[PDB]
Symmetry: D2
């Protein structure tokens, strides 16, 4: 199917668009059809992408891949990441090895890694008040208020606890290395069928992250005794205002993201270089 190739970038970088110019010329010389993102095309003179491309190449950091994954996941189109120079959890191809790597994938040497996303649904009673997907995390937080908020947590209909905190981070394995990690959560291997729940700046010192089955359904009830309207954020990009008493329901989407890596992809190598963990011992 690899004939219609889409390219997405994050603007504002010399080095990005240089990688872009190198990629276009490499695929054109392979007699492939190349479709630029409407916004990236305005930076080099010369949402619907998943529907027409058989493969989408994302140039940028893990953040660029994040924005593109929700759109590409629902369209069942494979996604390949090129980083800005160092490995990212979602972007494995270095810019200077672009021709080797990308040509390797187009020729048929690549590994496929499903990643699951979350569905966030805000409700007032049974009325939907907003729905968003998230590859990394669904985050409940106070928005513009500088006060702590209050909420209850249910998992598969069972009451877990109430708490006072800034909010809550609910993360996939992909998101376990992003906000959740900074907030004290564990790393979860990308193949783990699990969801982590990480309290944000909790009042209660014995608050601790919980890891639950990936097929679990989460329900957050915003406290009806609050005076402020908190916010729910998906991948830090799609936002919804919640009223006191609203519910936020979170579970795993059926359609997972088809993420492509070169055959030499190594998840732990990525952890070592990004997080600085020790390499093999010497003498």
């Amino acid at each position: 199917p690899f004939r219609n190739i889409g390219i997405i970038g994050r603007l504002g970088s010399t080095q990005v668009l240089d990688t872009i110019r190198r990629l276009k010329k490499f695929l054109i010389d392979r007699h492939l059809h190349v479709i630029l993102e409407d916004t990236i095309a305005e930076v080099l003179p010369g949402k619907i992408m998943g529907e027409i491309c058989d493969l989408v190449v994302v140039v940028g950091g893990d953040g660029s891949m994040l924005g593109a994954a929700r759109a590409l996941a629902r369209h069942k189109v494979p996604v390949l990441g090129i980083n800005r120079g160092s490995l990212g959890f979602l972007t494995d191809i270095r810019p200077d090895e672009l021709e080797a790597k990308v040509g390797e994938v187009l020729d048929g040497q690549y590994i496929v890694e499903s990643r699951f996303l979350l569905d966030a649904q805000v409700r007032r009673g049974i009325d939907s008040m907003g729905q968003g997907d998230a590859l990394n995390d669904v985050v409940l937080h106070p928005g513009k208020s500088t006060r702590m908020i209050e909420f209850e947590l249910y998992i598969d209909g069972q009451f877990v606890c109430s708490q006072k905190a800034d909010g809550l981070i609910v993360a996939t394995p992909t998101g376990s290395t992003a906000y959740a990690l900074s907030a004290g959560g564990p790393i979860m291997h990308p193949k783990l069928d699990a969801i982590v729940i990480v309290p944000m700046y909790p009042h209660m010192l014995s608050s601790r992250p919980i890891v639950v089955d990936g097929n679990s359904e989460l329900k957050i009830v915003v406290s009806p005794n609050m005076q402020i309207y908190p916010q729910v954020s998906c991948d830090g990009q799609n936002h919804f205002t919640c009223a006191p008493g609203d519910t936020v329901t979170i579970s795993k989407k059926p359609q997972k993201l088809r993420l492509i890596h070169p055959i030499d992809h190594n998840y732990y190598e990525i952890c070592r270089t990004k997080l600085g963990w020790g390499s093999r011992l010497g003498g």
Copy 2:
């Protein structure tokens, strides 16, 4: 099968043996055969237990249940816990509700909860240097040395990292609320098929716990450049000395522990009362 009932206790408590005397009289008046633990029987005048009992009742804390689980797990005998007054993660029955609860189970109203254990195997080359089971955790630590130790971690044959630390905590979901929790690890729901790896007092500040698939095989290589012999501990009860260069291999045992709870058992209620988490909101 509930005819041969075994009873294990932790000695040194008035309240323990009072619970014991109440339990014996309750089962005898049910015309059941009651077998006391050799050591508990010496405190009231008047290992092989899994082989003859159809049910074993453990009286004591979570720690008493821990010691009994490795023996009872391999014999496929169900285990029921009575706490010392407050819920434990493994002991759900309060002493004052003993007659109601225990009679409920013997009559047939009970829930069954498989818990998996870990197998720890120390090796020098291919030679076994010690094997132990663990319901909570396999812990690598410096023993009597007060210096940091050094080791490498492999998961399913793949190199993860080396590090300098006091050691490593490898925990089941059951053990996720014990040592691993104090060391900063996440809580893992008892039904989660996962293992958590928690570094102990790591030199590297970006060290963080990792959650891996429950069917993963872990291999720790003790650094060959060390001058001290670290220790491996299973459930803090079975200990093995490791030489520089020895390996510790850790995976999930096939035979899981058949843990019994009354029908009203609620895992999150236990988290709230033990950890002090907030209850349902009020007005």
Copy 3:
């Protein structure tokens, strides 16, 4: 001798309003001059007592009683610290790090203090100054903390930290909490900071969920001057919040200078006050044996 007594209360709670009525009757029955803060008086008309602003209450009162808990104590302290007027707190129900008087025990405990039986200690405050180049863009004091954060934005913010003009680091984080010993048990504690005993002359700097995992709180001498430079490459305006109650919008490139305020808050307690008991019961710590 306490003759003129001010009352400050954080409006909202109904039980707070009743506690102020009991406190009013109690002080007037001791033949003392009660003075009500402007807003509080407007919430309960018919009082017939002298009123004044929060800002001036310290110029005319021997003692101020604060109703409404720790958060309400912060606003009181910011007004009264410059006046050297001692402050006494009454709980909303549960004990706090700044209030040790249950409304249950109002008459007994405030009576003891008025009868000359009390503990008095001082607590220092922070002084935060926002600058855009050499122009002043907002000043606020804080008893607990000065907090740089993204406001309504969900993005991480980038900043540099200087202490006495020496570059410490730059980082990407949710923000930065700068806390007094008083504030060390509040937002800073929830962000992973240490507890600082109130007698310690020190300031704690706590990165808020930093992207760099090796980032860690630093405790510095209390006479240190801190400088936070908001990265000129930010695309959002961060917020600086003093005690979570007074706020300033920062532009990219703005600096925030923080140092210890010369005038300290004078905090009165009943003689039974015990800081470690407060820690033990508010934080759950174990007791004897």
Copy 4:
């Protein structure tokens, strides 16, 4: 003027032994009197230089140079602090919180110091005293930390904490780290403690993986006297370790009293020494922009 130079080195590393040979030649070529510590001299015979004990090296030296990194600096500091003799550290390879001289740059950097160009600061130490009732059961100083731990036992230990005779709490934990500002970046940091700037007159108390999740580090004034009571209900003998290098066995019921030592360590650095640069490169913190 530095005339008499002592050398202290932690034996074991081969590269350490070479660095001591280069340092020896360098000082003798400047016509200075070199003095070798008893054990070090026995590792390289034929030197023909005056030797002395570690304990007395401070009575006869103008300056002591320490080879072998931060851990080796701790033992040197414990011997020399009581003598007011300045100490200069040489790295084993990578820079440290106590040594800023690469063996690569030995002659240039030690030359600068000897030629009168240096930074000098003082660091305080802890004094730990074990008592069984009113009998003394062991005393040790520490530049980094005094650590109560279970020794070879795997069980949690139970203890009470007192500060200036006031009960703080009892708890169940792996143990307790008590650290100076110098030690705040060592074991205490790995246990979740904060960094304390070396200028801060403070001590940090860090529970080691406490069973109580609400347990948290506390920072107290540096002139505070700490008291740890080993629970009389322990069935194992815990250990008290000073700087991880000097050890005492405690019985159930024994107390450990910890306070600041009057005599401070005099620490010399090259003029290019920068504490925050040390933090940035040893901990990974971000730099300008």
